[PDB]
Amino acid sequence: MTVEPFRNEPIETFQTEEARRAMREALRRVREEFGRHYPLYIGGEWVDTKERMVSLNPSAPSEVVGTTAKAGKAEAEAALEAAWKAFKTWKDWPQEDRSRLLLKAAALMRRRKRELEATLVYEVGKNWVEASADVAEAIDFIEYYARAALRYRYPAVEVVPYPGEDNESFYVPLGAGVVIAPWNFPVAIFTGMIVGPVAVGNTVIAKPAEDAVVVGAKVFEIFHEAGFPPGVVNFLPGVGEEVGAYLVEHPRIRFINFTGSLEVGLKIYEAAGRLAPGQTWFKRAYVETGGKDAIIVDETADFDLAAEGVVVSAYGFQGQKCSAASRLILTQGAYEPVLERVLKRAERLSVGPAEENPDLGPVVSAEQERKVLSYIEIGKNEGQLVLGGKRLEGEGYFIAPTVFTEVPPKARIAQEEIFGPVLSVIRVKDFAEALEVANDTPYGLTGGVYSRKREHLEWARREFHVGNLYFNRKITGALVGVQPFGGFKLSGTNAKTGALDYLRLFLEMKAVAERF
Amino acid sequence: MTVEPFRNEPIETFQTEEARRAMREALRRVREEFGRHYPLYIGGEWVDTKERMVSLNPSAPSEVVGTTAKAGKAEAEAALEAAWKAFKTWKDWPQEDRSRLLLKAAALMRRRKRELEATLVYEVGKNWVEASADVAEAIDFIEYYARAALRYRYPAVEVVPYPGEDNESFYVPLGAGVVIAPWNFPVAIFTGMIVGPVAVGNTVIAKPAEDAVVVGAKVFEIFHEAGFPPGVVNFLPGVGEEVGAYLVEHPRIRFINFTGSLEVGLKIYEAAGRLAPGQTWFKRAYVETGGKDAIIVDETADFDLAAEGVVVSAYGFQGQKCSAASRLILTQGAYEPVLERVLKRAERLSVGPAEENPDLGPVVSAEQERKVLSYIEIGKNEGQLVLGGKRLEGEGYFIAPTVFTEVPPKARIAQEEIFGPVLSVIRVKDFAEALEVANDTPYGLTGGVYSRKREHLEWARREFHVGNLYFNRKITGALVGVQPFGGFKLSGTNAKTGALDYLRLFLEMKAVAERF
Ligand SMILES: NC(=O)c1ccc[n+]([C@@H]2O[C@H](COP(=O)([O-])OP(=O)(O)OC[C@H]3O[C@@H](n4cnc5c(N)ncnc54)[C@H](OP(=O)(O)O)[C@@H]3O)[C@@H](O)[C@H]2O)c1
Ligand SMILES: NC(=O)c1ccc[n+]([C@@H]2O[C@H](COP(=O)([O-])OP(=O)(O)OC[C@H]3O[C@@H](n4cnc5c(N)ncnc54)[C@H](OP(=O)(O)O)[C@@H]3O)[C@@H](O)[C@H]2O)c1
Numbered sequence A, B: 001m002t003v004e005p006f007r008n009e010p011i012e013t014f015q016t017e018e019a020r021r022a023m024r025e026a027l028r029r030v031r032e033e034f035g036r037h038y039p040l041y042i043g044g045e046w047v048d049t050k051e052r053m054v055s056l057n058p059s060a061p062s063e064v065v066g067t068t069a070k071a072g073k074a075e076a077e078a079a080l081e082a083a084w085k086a087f088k089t090w091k092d093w094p095q096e097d098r099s100r101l102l103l104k105a106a107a108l109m110r111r112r113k114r115e116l117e118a119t120l121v122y123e124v125g126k127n128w129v130e131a132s133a134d135v136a137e138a139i140d141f142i143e144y145y146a147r148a149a150l151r152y153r154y155p156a157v158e159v160v161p162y163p164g165e166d167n168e169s170f171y172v173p174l175g176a177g178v179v180i181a182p183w184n185f186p187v188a189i190f191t192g193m194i195v196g197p198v199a200v201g202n203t204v205i206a207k208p209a210e211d212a213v214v215v216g217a218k219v220f221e222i223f224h225e226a227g228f229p230p231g232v233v234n235f236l237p238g239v240g241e242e243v244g245a246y247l248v249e250h251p252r253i254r255f256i257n258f259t260g261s262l263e264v265g266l267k268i269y270e271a272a273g274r275l276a277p278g279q280t281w282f283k284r285a286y287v288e289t290g291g292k293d294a295i296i297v298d299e300t301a302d303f304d305l306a307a308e309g310v311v312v313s314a315y316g317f318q319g320q321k322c323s324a325a326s327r328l329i330l331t332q333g334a335y336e337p338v339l340e341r342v343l344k345r346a347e348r349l350s351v352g353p354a355e356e357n358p359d360l361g362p363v364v365s366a367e368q369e370r371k372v373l374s375y376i377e378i379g380k381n382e383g384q385l386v387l388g389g390k391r392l393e394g395e396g397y398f399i400a401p402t403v404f405t406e407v408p409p410k411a412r413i414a415q416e417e418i419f420g421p422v423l424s425v426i427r428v429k430d431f432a433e434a435l436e437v438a439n440d441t442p443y444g445l446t447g448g449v450y451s452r453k454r455e456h457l458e459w460a461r462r463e464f465h466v467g468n469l470y471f472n473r474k475i476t477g478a479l480v481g482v483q484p485f486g487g488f489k490l491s492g493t494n495a496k497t498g499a500l501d502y503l504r505l506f507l508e509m510k511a512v513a514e515r516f
């Protein structure tokens, strides 16, 4: 295989008339398609069920974007049999052949980009640029992992020679595993978690989040068209606590690739440590969980630059990002200048139906709305509400950009992942205290520093204990290949997506010696 | 750091008069020191306790070879404090400085080779060459990991650049962890499991097996003389199910590096999956467990070569190896010729006090003797006893080389790890059936094939599902660097010792971007 060097898929900003025209048509066609039903995909065929999953439009929840079939235990078993049967032959494909299949899937995804973006807009309430970033990231995972997999090809291991012998060490895939995905990046993360393991010869049963089952099905339409052999990838929309747990706990599941809440991640990691009756291996579980991410600004920073980056990081996709700035830690000299600029910028943000390309669409569901509003009530008794803090008028789940200030570092709203448009501002004396506060949470995912002082930046490089750290720019939107993505502490197992190391997680090593 | 390319430490054969003289001298020195008491080693100092552990000579169990202090929970806590305190600064050492420390420790160990070998002879009943192989492997781990660690040095990660930014990804060590070690390779595996994590900036609390506490203490004498900073390595002889479990379950233990039985490995892996109260990370646990390792011989093999390799593999160190051939799978054409040669060779093996350099010393303990004799009784009900199966005369735990034939593939003696000098012989139709029988255990550690048929060897390369596979040679004695060592299935987590990949297990990755 020889292809062009990897480059990231450009993120569309929709500033040209051509881009706006294409997006309007894609939005119109997706809207006109509301109510479509998508079956399961098992062993190379679409398989329907009696029960269904319903996906609502969070900007107008009386509108059904689509429905899917619903996987229970029988369908989970059928998918297991298909995946294990497929693994037996898929594992023996030359890596070049598997990588070409990924490249075909990326080309098909790229040709369906506007459609997939438009589906994100309606199904999970992304504005147009957030939708474009999500799809571009998905394409990047396929392109990146296709190339990275070749770096592991037979026989890839560097060993010490021995007289009179051939010593050959090589990687082999693990088997059939389950991928359990979140609603907040339901094209990007769903795709990445599936194609990485599959690229190197594993087979996958994929369980999309309930709120994002339609866009999950469209990704599977791409996989089917690309021509992955029957059983290699399987699509099981259903209830995580039911069919997801069933697969996690199953003796015949080899690995679990999970991205989602800390609460669920803890249950999955604990279950994966157990030997199910008849199980004949130690399960691998990769769990990438939440964050309570901070941006620190000190008195040497460009305050206008900082305020812009904070607003982007805090409120992009309504704060529903594992990478979102939910804490703003300001040294004494930075406090007033930065807070005033952040408030001025944030009060200008538009909120409305995602199709309108507002600054913020709705949060994803009634239950998410309930949780975010609950945390706002908690926050009112912990810090000082200085902006927003209300549901807005309308059927859609619209919440105003919200700011609390003078927040105690140990307050619930300064410790717990709210996953909505809610920023907690913490005032500290100096940079040392800023780092102490930044580090003092159970999490360790993303972080940022705005500062012109070299010594503060390099100190943070050494001591701001997060897996993805950014200086003088936004802390969201890690690019595949550029910024290996994954955290420390209770932000998960540090499985770095979009990095060469990711694929090693889905391989084991054999060493074979022949004495001549 | 520029040192000579890695080479394996030569294993002494004692064919010269000088080597034999040097060994006799070392045996004399070691036994003159049987009265010695060895304290714990915590925070850079030897620390004694009220209670003690006693180590016996398995060739003469009324003879005490030494005593050590005994770590309980309070000592575990003191070691944890020391290890975390040391981690704060040890993690910041330049890799070159840490690697030099390892190389110093290797040089000190090499200078004490005969002393350590003699200690293995008396404490765990290794004959001379088994003892020399163990010490040489220990030296190899130190030399190999010192060099391999430099491959991870700041900033090691290959990333995709982005305009107007520096993007820098690099590895950092995890923290303080616990190493829990077996008695069968109590210099080699004890050393490897400690120095691998330590090389890249972790700190370690090491819990030697009860039967091998004296030689573990001597390894710590080397670490102390080498000058590891206080708290970087700590020595806690004690009861696995007490102080070992305490550390495994502790919220402040970052990782667990374990080699031992499947029974214990299962408990450790399960515990490691749980969030202990106040714990702030997902624990990493590496567990390398037992094997039920087979050698296949087909009718095309050199039967004399096969018989010699089978006897070495089955009976080296009394079969007390995770890699030992405990199953001999013979195709119909190979059955009589190979079995007759194996019996003729095995019946000529000497058994006696390890210091006399017999073919077999004693098994390690009264408990091991009881286990092995119990499996012999089970075997009598499952297969045909054709050689040995008896305790031999003397206080020492001497058991005769044992062979059962016509053993059903699903018999307990064909499935369960006996860890003694007991070989189960299984007759099969052809090579296909040989592979089916080879694969049909819960384990997947080592395996071998004797055959001249290229198609059978290459078939086995693809389908004999063990981590370490050997053609036309013994299946024990994996060399550091040459044969990455670790298994599949219930043989553990595939942490490949003596391989570049090993050190990655003890690192996490940070990605830091600066937008200029
Ligand atoms: N670290 C990262 O890279 C990363 C990336 C994106 C998101 N996240 C995190 O994900 C969270 C938001 O996503 P979410 O609300 O979808 O998370 P979630 O509630 O944890 O659900 C994630 C997935 O797990 C399933 N699930 C729920 N309970 C389960 C169980 N007991 N066993 C097996 N599966 C189960 C869900 O199914 P249902 O939909 O049927 O409930 C869904 O598919 C946030 O905490 C965010 O920080 C982390
Ligand atoms: N896969 C490999 O690379 C490899 C290599 C060598 C040996 N082994 C395996 O090791 C086994 C023989 O070694 P062994 O008899 O020393 O194994 P073991 O009985 O499992 O003991 C291993 C270590 O674990 C400790 N331990 C026992 N129970 C514990 C618990 N509940 N929690 C934490 N630690 C605990 C022991 O302490 P105590 O001494 O106080 O009981 C000892 O230090 C065989 O199965 C062999 O195959 C595997």
Ligand code: NA
Binding pocket: A055, A056, A057, A058, A065, A123, A124, A210, A211, A212
């Ligand atoms: Na929806």
Ligand code: NA
Binding pocket: B055, B056, B057, B058, B122, B123, B124, B211, B212
């Ligand atoms: Na002993």
